[PDB]
Paper text:
As a result, two inhibitors, [name] and E64d were identified with an IC50 value of 5.43 and 88.85 nM for [name], and 174.30 and 244.26 nM for CTSB. To explore the inhibition mechanism of [name] and E64d, we determined the crystal structures of these compounds bound to human [name] and CTSB. All of these structures were solved at a high resolution with unambiguous electron density in the binding pocket of enzymes, allowing us to clearly define the interactions. Both [name] and CTSB belong to the papain superfamily and have a typical cysteine protease fold. Two domains delimit an active-site cleft containing the conserved catalytic cysteine and histidine residues. In the structure of [name] in complex with [name], this compound was found in the active site cleft. The density for [name] is connected to Cys25, evidence of a covalent bond. The sulfonyl group is located in the oxyanion hole formed by the side chains of Gln19, Trp189, and His163 and the main chain of Cys25, whose function is to stabilize the carbonyl oxygen of the substrate at the tetrahedral intermediate stage of proteolysis. In addition, [name] forms three hydrogen bonds with the backbone amides of Gly68 and Asp162. The phenyl sulfone, phenethyl, benzyl and N-methyl piperazine moieties of [name] insert into the S1'-S3 subsites, forming hydrophobic interactions which further stabilize the inhibitor. [name] and E64d, as endocytosis-mediated entrance pathway inhibitors, could effectively reduce the infectivity of the [name]-[name]-2 Omicron BA.2 variant in Calu-3 cells with an EC50 value of 14.0 nM (Selectivity index (SI) = 7,829, SI is calculated as the ratio of CC50 value against EC50 value, a common measurement for comparing cytotoxicity and antiviral potency of compounds) and 239.8 nM (SI > 4,000).
Host proteases, TMPRSS2 and [name]/CTSB cleave the [name]-[name]-2 spike to play a crucial role in the two alternative pathways of viral entry and are characterized as promising pharmacological targets. The entry of [name]-[name]-2 depends on two distinctive pathways, cell surface entry and endosomal entry, where the transmembrane serine protease, TMPRSS2, and endosomal cysteine proteases cathepsin L/B ([name]/CTSB) cleave the viral spike protein. The crystal structures of TMPRSS2 and [name]/CTSB in complex with the potent inhibitors were determined to reveal their specific mode of interaction.
Author numbering: 1 to 220
Amino acid sequence: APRSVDWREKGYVTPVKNQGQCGSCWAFSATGALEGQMFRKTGRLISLSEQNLVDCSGPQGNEGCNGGLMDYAFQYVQDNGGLDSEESYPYEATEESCKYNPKYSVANDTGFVDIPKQEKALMKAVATVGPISVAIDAGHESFLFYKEGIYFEPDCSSEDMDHGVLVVGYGFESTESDNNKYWLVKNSWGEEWGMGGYVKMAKDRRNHCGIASAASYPTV
Ligand SMILES: *[C@H](CS(=O)(=O)c1ccccc1)[C@H](CCc1ccccc1)NC(=O)[C@H](Cc1ccccc1)NC(=O)N1CCN(C)CC1
Ligand SMILES: C[As](C)(=O)[O-]
Ligand SMILES: C[As](C)(=O)[O-]
Ligand SMILES: [Zn+2]
Ligand SMILES: [Zn+2]
Ligand SMILES: [Zn+2]
Ligand SMILES: [Zn+2]
Ligand SMILES: [Zn+2]
Ligand SMILES: [Zn+2]
Ligand SMILES: [Zn+2]
């Protein structure tokens, strides 16, 4: 596998969005992976509607602004037979009754695949599939005030995660006596958080913050 991957430079990744005051991270993670897979399929990078997912994927098990699962979001897109564009169905950071319009559907998926809970398996997936939906333990003050560098949190859990994000690549910063490897992770907290909306999560450091424990991607 490549020692460095960054799917943003390959056109797979849309700009950083902002979930606002709503626990819809799962929606932004799922649209991220679907935007990447649709781009691979059609050569078109189109922004997908998280609001469509928040309002409409309740039957699949999601809870709107109270949380959800990326896999349930992929199931909605399969069950629904489509997903509206971000332009047609813009994000409002609130829960509202479903407004899906089949006329504005710009994406489909045929299911999803769950990656084994090993960082090696996640790496090969990022290297060959594209951006990957993952969940991490982001429930700490250091994550909230992260600005730059490789994030490492000693109290992070490898099993208990609360935040759905998107891995768009990986790399390494090399010092004299250490290759400090990282996951390139796209947050949904606006572009003023972290590195323009991005965080470098510690990689190959015992599944730090659970990043390999709930990884999946949609199939198109
Ligand atoms: C998004 C993350 S967040 O809002 O940025 C956040 C919040 C707190 C701490 C860290 C990060 C949401 C937040 C859900 C939430 C709502 C209201 C109050 C507190 C939290 N997180 C989720 O949607 C997660 C995603 C996820 C996917 C896979 C594995 C682990 C987590 N899921 C989630 O919270 N739930 C709710 C309970 N339900 C049974 C499952 C989905
Ligand atoms: C502080 As916690 C329950 O997100 O590990
Ligand atoms: C937002 As929580 C207490 O499920 O980490
Ligand atoms: Zn560039
Ligand atoms: Zn959006
Ligand atoms: Zn409204
Ligand atoms: Zn899964
Ligand atoms: Zn938490
Ligand atoms: Zn924790
Ligand atoms: Zn928990």
